[PDB]
C-alpha cells in the first residue's frame, strides 16, 4: 500500500522531524500539496536530528514525505496514531538497504502546534 | 490508566526527543530503571525541540517519562506503535493546564537505533 | 486524559466489537451522539466476542464507549490507528480490578465499511 | 516493506478475529511456527466476522496473516498498537481490488487474554 502520505486538516501547522540511524547520507523531503515545503540531509548512526521545523499544511492538506540516500528511494512504513482524540502523529520509517530495521531515516509529524 | 511507562528491549540504545507547545517551560524527565536517566527544558509555542539525546534501556527494559510544568505534574497521555515489525515508536503528550491539546510537551521515543 | 470517545466521519458506518477477558459480566455501551445505541455483555476468561455490530456515526460523529462490570464503571484506555491513510480503528481497552491488564472488556471500531 | 508479520511473546495465547468488506469471497489464513494455524473464509460487504478463534503463539512468537480472494494474495497493511504497555493490537487492512479501501478483510490480533 502507499506509505508515507498524510491528509492533515487544512491550513493547519506541524512539526516535522528527521532522524539518522544508517551509513548512508540520509535526505527526507517533506511535500504539502505535492511541492517539496522542507528538506534534511546528514548522516548518523546515532540517531541525530537532521532537521526540525514547523510547516503549514495549505490549502489541501496532503503532506507527503520522501526518503533518499544519493538520488535512490528508500522503502518507505508509515502509520498514523491519535491519543485522547485531540493529538496527532505521523509515523514514517525508511529501509535504505537490506536489515530491514526501517530506521535509516525515521521521520515524525506531529499536530496540533501551539 | 499509567501513561508514560513503556518497557523496551533489555540493555537497547534509544532516542528520547522532547518539544514545547505552552506558554509554560517544560521540565521533561526520563527515567531508565527508575532513575532519572536525563532531563530536558525549555519553553516554546512553535514545537522547539527542547532536548534530544540517546539512551540505554538497561537491564530491566523500563522507561518512563514524566512532565512538570510551572510547579505541577502534567497529565499524560501515551501509546507505542510498531512499523513492519521493526521500527518501534513510543508516544507521550501531556497536558498543562485547561485547554486539553495535549501537546504541551511531546516526547518521541523510537528504537532500535543504528 | 479522557478514553473512550473518537469523532468518526459523519453519517458513515462503522463496525463495533466486543471481546470479554475477565471473571466479572462485561457489559459494554456504545453512544453515538450521546445517546445508547448498543449494549453488549458477556462473562468469559478467553476472549469471547459478546457483540458485533454495524451503526452510523450520525450527523455529529461523535462515538463514545462505556464499560461497567457489576455496575461500577471500569477504568478505559484508547487510541486510533490509520493506515495507509484510510483505514481507522478506534482502540478501547478497560481494567475491572487491580490486575492493570486492560483486556477484561476490549472494543475495537472500525471505519469505514462496505 | 513486509506487512501482516507480528512477533508476539512466546507461548502465549491471542485472539484472532477477521471481517469482510468486499464483494469478493475473502480467505484469511493464520500462520504459527510458520504453518497455517486458522483459516477463516466468507463473504460480506457488512463488516460481518468471517471467523474468531483463540490460537498459541508458540516457541518463536510468529504469527502471519495472509489474505486471498478466489486465489489471488490481497495486497496488506499492518501495524501493532500498545496501550497503557499492557493491552495489544495487531491490525490487518487488506486489499482485493482497485479502491484502496483495505477492508476487504480485516484483521484483528490482541493479547494478552485471560
Ligand atoms: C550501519 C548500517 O547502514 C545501512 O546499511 C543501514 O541500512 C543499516 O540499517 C545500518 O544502519
Ligand atoms: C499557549 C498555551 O499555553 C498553555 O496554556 C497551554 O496549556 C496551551 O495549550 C497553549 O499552548
Ligand atoms: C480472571 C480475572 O478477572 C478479573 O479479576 C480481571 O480484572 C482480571 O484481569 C482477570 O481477567
Ligand atoms: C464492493 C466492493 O468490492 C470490492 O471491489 C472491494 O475491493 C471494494 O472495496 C468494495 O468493497
Ligand atoms: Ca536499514
Ligand atoms: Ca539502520
Ligand atoms: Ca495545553
Ligand atoms: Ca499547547
Ligand atoms: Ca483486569
Ligand atoms: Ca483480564
Ligand atoms: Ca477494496
Ligand atoms: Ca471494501
Same mark, same amino acid.
Given at each position: 500500500?502507499?506509505?508515507?502520505?498524510? $491528509? /492533515?486538516?487544512?491550513? $493547519?501547522?506541524?512539526?516535522?522531524?528527521?532522524?539518522?540511524? &544508517? &551509513?548512508?547520507?540520509? $535526505?527526507?523531503?517533506? @511535500?504539502?500539496? *505535492?511541492?517539496?515545503?522542507? $528538506?534534511?540531509?546528514?548522516?548518523?548512526?546515532?540517531?541525530? !536530528?537532521?532537521?526540525?521545523?514547523?510547516?503549514?499544511?495549505?490549502?489541501?492538506?496532503?503532506?507527503? !514525505?520522501?526518503? %533518499?540516500?544519493?538520488?535512490?528511494?528508500? =522503502? @518507505?512504513? &508509515?502509520?498514523?496514531?491519535?491519543?485522547? *482524540?485531540? /493529538?496527532?502523529?505521523? @509515523?514514517?520509517? %525508511?529501509? +535504505?538497504?537490506? =536489515?530491514? =530495521?526501517?530506521? +535509516?531515516?525515521?521521520?515524525?509529524?506531529?499536530?496540533? @502546534?501551539?
Amino acid at each position: 500500500a502507499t506509505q508515507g502520505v498524510f $491528509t /492533515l486538516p487544512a491550513n $493547519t501547522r506541524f512539526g516535522v522531524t528527521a532522524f539518522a540511524n &544508517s &551509513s548512508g547520507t540520509q $535526505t527526507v523531503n517533506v @511535500l504539502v500539496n *505535492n511541492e517539496t515545503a522542507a $528538506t534534511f540531509s546528514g548522516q548518523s548512526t546515532n540517531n541525530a !536530528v537532521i532537521g526540525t521545523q514547523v510547516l503549514n499544511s495549505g490549502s489541501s492538506g496532503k503532506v507527503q !514525505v520522501q526518503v %533518499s540516500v544519493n538520488g535512490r528511494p528508500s =522503502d @518507505l512504513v &508509515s502509520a498514523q496514531v491519535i491519543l485522547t *482524540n485531540e /493529538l496527532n502523529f505521523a @509515523l514514517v520509517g %525508511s529501509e +535504505d538497504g537490506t =536489515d530491514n =530495521d526501517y530506521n +535509516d531515516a525515521v521521520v515524525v509529524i506531529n499536530w496540533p @502546534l501551539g
